[PDB]
Design a protein around this ligand. Structure first.
Ligand SMILES: CC1=C(C(=O)Nc2ccc3[nH]ncc3c2)[C@H](c2ccc(F)c(C(=O)NCc3nccc4ccccc34)c2)NC(=O)N1
Ligand SMILES: [Mg+2]
Lengths: 339, 62, 618
């Protein structure tokens, strides 16, 4: 019958695609880097604290100027902070309480946010009277907005519990492209640096690679045992790390189409919530659910450092485009900055 | 359930199968490469002292 | 202290949900309440030119139904027609069905003006006022004022301390009645105080709990001829009724002082009493105790029926028991297992009236103080009547004192209407009887018993307020005044903040309003904060500050009603064994916050649970 051949074919295609990869497994990344010098211990200290959110922090994002960032909280607000000075440039009260994500358009001029409202809302940062108007409410998704990132001031890519991601013309609020493919709520997404690709991690325990302009999935990496809460590109654009509920991080190379390295220990059982590389990509920072960020050596995979500080889950983090600092939000209602 | 679904999936898997892969060792090498090439310009790795670091003991900002 | 203070308009957020919860915000429900009507009316006439003329008309129509004559009517009906129907037809802004408009036009030119001439118009005005005009009224702040008065009403708890009590003006086995002013609004009332102790010792818990239920049945409708109830309440030793004030004393006393009454004088009392019965009888209540001591005078001489302890409700099951005063009870009353309805009062009306003409009950002869003597004389003996009586007076008494129900005037299928058209009353015009226009004939001037909490349960659902009464009491005294004084006290503060921005707008806020959380109980610390309930969090603030604290729905484990200083509070149990307590400024606030916080956290907790990023992972 018709399906049973198509099911037959998909099975014997996955088997084929498995072997294609096993054919490139001549070496481990571990072997290949067995020769280089450790990074030693990385001690980072808390240069700033950002207090102001009245409840859990769920997400944050640096402005490209490595100075400003936006946070989003259970307290139904976006704050934009001057990280240098702890100065709330804007508090922004939202229209739904249930926010989950936020983004800072690379230009400085808009921020976006969204959550269980199922809408991405663009806030304009200086209008006529330099007030903070809402500019659009990109409605179209049929599930909670889980992450979103601006390409520029006119386009934005979102991800959702409706198992899809999507591309939007901000100007007309049009859902330009949609990326079906995932079979589980989509959780984090990350834009390639050239911005013609992006990856997404989801609850089906897979990450996918997508072509912005073609609207198709190029590749699918698997092998996490559980939900994938977060994801981030290696700065060169060829590999990305994912963090899972299964207590590991994993580096995947695009070009070898596979996993390269697993970051984990027996001591660690708590799930991962966010990831980000340092500038050179040598350091993989991951936020865990035991209130620590662990710092990892990407190339060797030994735990090089810990950013202990917060008293509850670390919900989110990021490194600044210039490489100076790491930000970290938590359920304890603070952000903290670290060199 | 649906015929056109099974079809679209297979087309995907074909797409995914026909890409040019590369030896793990090559890609791994290329990463390590990048990581050296820029360890010079990465403040979390090579500690750049307080004068250039906007956070440490500073207070002079726009 | 002792006058009414209205809550602040902030109260609108809370009450409006409290009422929406009860289908209480219809046009239909608000229009039918005195205070509602009043506020609604202000709105239309003064604030909304689109509907002014619609109500003006409604009222000009209203007054026309009170007009006494057909020459006063045809005169008015032209003016009304000319002024509110006609002129609008000529400019084509008369939005009413032509079946309604010609139903009127037809009768005017054919000179037939019953008081129900404009009845299809009322109807249609109400259709026009419902919903759309009604909408702008909810949005209007007259509806703010409505919620304010409504909050007061729904928070009425009375004690003996809300009235100044005066002279004792009533006595019975089980308590006494005092006259009194209600400080609140200045109104004079009677206060009946039954003592529970005297009740238990004499076993009369039923025959007192009854008196209340009965007063409920009757006290709507504003009867000029019954002693009605505006409130009941209690304290531990006493039950208490607030009743219409009658300080003329009863007929049983006035009989002795005046001696017998003429027919003409007696006619008056009988007239009022009838109407009094009528009212009761339409509400399916037999009085039963009807006699001179149960009829009181006011200061002017007009009378009313009082003490409805023996009155019962035949609306469901008719009575068979021999319960009334010996000498006035009918035949069918006397024989046990023999049922009876309203029929019974008419016989007693009979006997009572003999008594006002004659000195004694018809059956109480030989000064007999023995009961079984009358028992039997009433059932057996047909009744003989002084030939000093006029014959139409006979015609009446004969009809009333019929031992056969099927032959008794009052009982023959039209209730009271028959009695009124006895030839004894041919000289009277009952519209005038009912407006009390006829001049009245007479114008006046130890225990060792214990009380178990098993007995306070007996008197549990006793406290009561008749809303229609309260709103009237208010309407006719302080309502206009208090609205003014408030209008000023609010207009100060709004003009003055010029802090204007409103924090709940533009958001997903469920509800907001005042409450006082508890700090350190040992310091009787209650901070009074403004709260905002959002679907996931409960924020609150003090002054000159947006909310700087909060409590999240997901950390709340249970919400319970708990008394602290017997002053009922909300106790929230928090996740980390912690506790959070709130006192709100009125019964209905509590009820609503308890509902909404309960619904809020129940949902949020269940929704969060289904989101990986927000859910917990034990
Ligand atoms: C009309 C009336 C009485 C009376 O005066 N009642 C009264 C009521 C309303 C008023 N408004 N303004 C004045 C005024 C007066 C008086 C009276 C005044 C106060 C009382 F407590 C009782 C009384 O207790 N009656 C007996 C009784 N009352 C209630 C429940 C009972 C239950 C069992 C047995 C007897 C019961 C009786 N004696 C009486 O024969 N009839
Ligand atoms: Mg009987």
């Amino acid at each position: 019958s018709e399906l049973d051949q198509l099911r037959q074919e998909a099975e014997q295609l996955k088997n084929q695609i498995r072997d294609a990869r096993k054919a490139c497994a001549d070496a481990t990344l571990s072997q290949i880097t067995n020769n280089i010098d450790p990074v030693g211990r990385i001690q980072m200290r808390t240069r700033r604290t950002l207090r102001g959110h009245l409840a859990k922090i769920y997400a944050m994002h640096w402005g490209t100027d490595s100075r400003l960032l936006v946070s989003a909280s259970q307290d139904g607000k976006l704050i934009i902070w001057d990280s240098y000075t702890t100065n709330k440039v804007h508090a922004i009260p939202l229209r739904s309480s249930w926010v989950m994500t936020c983004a800072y358009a690379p230009s400085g001029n808009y921020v976006a946010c969204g959550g269980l409202d199922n809408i991405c809302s663009i806030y304009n940062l200086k209008t006529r009277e330099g007030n903070v108007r809402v500019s659009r409410e990109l409605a179209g998704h049929t599930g909670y907005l889980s992450c979103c990132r601006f390409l520029d001031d006119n386009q934005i890519v979102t991800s959702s519990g409706d198992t899809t991601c999507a591309l939007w013309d901000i100007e007309t609020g049009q859902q330009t492209t949609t990326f079906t493919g995932h079979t589980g709520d989509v959780m984090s997404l990350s834009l390639a640096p050239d911005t013609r690709l992006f990856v997404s991690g989801a609850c089906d325990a897979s990450a996918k690679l997508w072509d912005v302009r073609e609207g198709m999935c190029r590749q699918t990496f698997t092998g996490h045992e559980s939900d994938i809460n977060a994801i981030c590109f290696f700065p060169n654009g060829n590999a990305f790390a994912t963090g899972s509920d299964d207590a590991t991080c994993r580096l995947f190379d695009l070009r070898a189409d596979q996993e390269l390295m697993t970051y984990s220990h027996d001591n660690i059982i708590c799930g991962i919530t966010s990831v980000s590389f340092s500038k050179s990509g040598r350091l993989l920072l991951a936020g865990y659910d035991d209130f620590n960020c662990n710092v990892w050596d990407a190339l060797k995979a030994d735990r090089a450092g810990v950013l202990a500080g917060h008293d509850n889950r670390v919900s989110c983090l990021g490194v600044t485009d210039d490489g100076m600092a790491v930000a970290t939000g938590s359920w304890d209602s603070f952000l903290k900055i670290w060199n | 359930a649906s015929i056109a679904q099974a079809r679209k999936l297979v087309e995907q898997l074909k797409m995914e199968a026909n890409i040019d892969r590369i030896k793990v060792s090559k890609a791994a090498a290329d990463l390590m490469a990048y990581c050296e090439a820029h360890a010079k310009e990465d403040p979390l790795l090579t500690p750049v002292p307080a004068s250039e670091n906007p956070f440490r003991e500073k207070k002079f900002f726009s | 202290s002792k006058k009414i203070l209205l809550p602040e308009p902030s109260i609108r957020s809370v009450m409006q949900k409290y009422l929406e919860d009860r289908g209480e915000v219809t046009f239909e429900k608000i229009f039918s309440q005195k205070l509602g009507y009043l506020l609604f009316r202000d709105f239309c006439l003064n604030h909304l030119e689109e509907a002014r003329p619609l109500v003006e008309f409604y009222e000009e129509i209203k007054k026309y139904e009170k007009l006494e004559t057909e020459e006063e009517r045809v005169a008015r009906s032209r003016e009304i027609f000319d002024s509110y129907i006609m002129k609008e037809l000529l400019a084509c802004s008369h939005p009413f069905s032509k079946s309604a408009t010609e139903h009127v036009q037809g009768h005017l030119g054919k000179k037939q003006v019953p008081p129900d001439l404009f009845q299809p118009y009322i109807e249609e005005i109400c259709q026009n006022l419902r919903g759309d005009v009604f909408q702008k009224f909810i949005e209007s702040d007259k509806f703010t004022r409505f919620c304010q008065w409504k909050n007061v009403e729904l928070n009425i708890h009375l004690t003996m301390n809300d009235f100044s009590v005066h002279r004792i003006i009533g006595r019975g086995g089980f308590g006494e009645v005092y006259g009194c002013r209600k400080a609140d609004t200045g109104k004079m009332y009677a206060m009946k105080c039954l003592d529970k102790k005297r009740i238990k010792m004499k076993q009369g818990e039923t025959l007192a709990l009854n008196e209340r239920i009965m007063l409920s049945l009757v006290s709507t409708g504003d009867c000029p001829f019954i002693v009605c109830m505006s409130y009941a309440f209690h304290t531990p030793d006493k039950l208490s009724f607030i009743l219409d004030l009658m300080n003329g004393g009863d007929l049983h006393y006035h009989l002795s002082q005046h001696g017998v009454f003429s027919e003409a004088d007696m006619r008056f009392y009988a007239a009022e009493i009838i109407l009094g019965l009528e009212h009761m009888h339409n509400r399916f209540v037999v009085y039963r105790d009807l006699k001179p001591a149960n009829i009181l005078l006011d200061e002017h001489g007009h009378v009313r029926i009082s003490d409805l302890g023996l009155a019962c409700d035949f609306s469901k099951k008719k009575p068979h028991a021999s319960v009334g005063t010996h000498g006035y009870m009918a035949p069918e009353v006397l024989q046990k297992g023999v049922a009876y309805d309203s029929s019974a009062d008419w016989f007693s009306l009979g006997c009572m009236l003999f008594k006002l003409l004659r000195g004694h009950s018809p059956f109480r002869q030989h000064k007999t103080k023995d009961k079984h003597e009358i028992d039997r004389m009433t059932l057996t003996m047909a009744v003989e009547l002084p030939d000093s009586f006029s014959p139409e007076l006979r015609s009446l008494l004969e009809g009333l004192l019929q031992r056969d129900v099927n032959r008794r005037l009052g009982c023959l299928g039209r209730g009271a209407q028959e009695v009124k058209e006895s030839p004894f009353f041919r000289s009277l015009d009952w519209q005038m009887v009912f407006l009390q226009k006829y001049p009245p004939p007479l114008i006046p001037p130890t225990k060792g018993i214990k009380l178990l909490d098993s007995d306070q349960e007996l008197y549990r659902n006793f406290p009561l307020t008749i809303s229609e009464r309260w709103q009237q009491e208010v309407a006719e005294t302080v309502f206009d005044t208090i609205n003014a004084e408030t209008d000023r006290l609010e207009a100060r503060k709004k003009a003055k903040n010029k802090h204007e921005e409103d924090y709940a707008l533009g958001k997903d806020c469920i509800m907001h309003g005042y409450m006082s959380k508890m700090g350190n109980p040992f310091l009787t610390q209650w901070q009074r904060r403004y709260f905002y309930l959002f679907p996931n969090r409960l924020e609150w603030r003090g002054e000159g500050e947006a909310p700087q604290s909060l409590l999240t729905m997901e950390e709340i484990q249970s919400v319970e009603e708990t008394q602290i200083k017997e002053r009922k509070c909300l106790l929230l149990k928090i996740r980390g064994g912690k506790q959070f307590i709130l006192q709100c400024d009125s019964d209905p606030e509590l009820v609503q916050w308890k509902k909404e916080l309960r619904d809020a956290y129940r949902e949020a907790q269940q929704l969060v649970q289904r989101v990986p990023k927000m859910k917990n992972k034990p």
